[PDB]
């Protein structure tokens, strides 16, 4: 079970946090990820932390301003976003997947778990 929260509207060039909390026994079992859909478009990959060593993942739309970081206590993954653009406005979804691999975790198809979404505005 993931449940999102610290979504809103927020200025060109701010910084925004929003995150991810999970059921807690399966906290060590499943790595996090995080994707997006802006309006009209596909969902995409946004951002990966693997269960296996915690590296994090990103995509090159949003390598270097977006990062990724857990709080194993809470049971809850963070996405920091510095330097917003208008283009990322979009519904920011977590979920959970099984595998530790960078090659499964920027992959959409590969996760078993979703959230229910955060809407992100950036004027």
């Known amino acids: 079970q993931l449940v999102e929260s610290g979504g809103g509207l927020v200025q060109a060039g701010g910084s925004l946090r929003v995150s991810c909390a999970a059921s807690g026994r399966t906290f060590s079992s499943y790595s996090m990820g995080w994707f997006r859909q802006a309006p009209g478009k596909e969902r995409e990959f946004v951002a990966a932390?693997?269960?296996?060593?915690?590296?994090?993942y990103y995509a090159d739309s949003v390598k270097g301003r977006f990062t990724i970081s857990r709080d194993s206590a809470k049971n809850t993954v963070y996405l920091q976003m510095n330097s917003l653009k208008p283009e990322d406005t979009a519904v920011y979804y977590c979920?959970?997947?099984?595998?530790?691999?960078?090659?499964?975790?920027?992959?959409?198809?590969?996760?078993?778990?979703w959230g229910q979404g955060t809407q992100v505005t950036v004027s």
């Open positions: 932390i693997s269960r296996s060593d915690n590296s994090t």
């Open positions: 979920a959970a997947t099984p595998y530790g691999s960078r090659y499964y975790l920027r992959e959409l198809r590969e996760y078993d778990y």
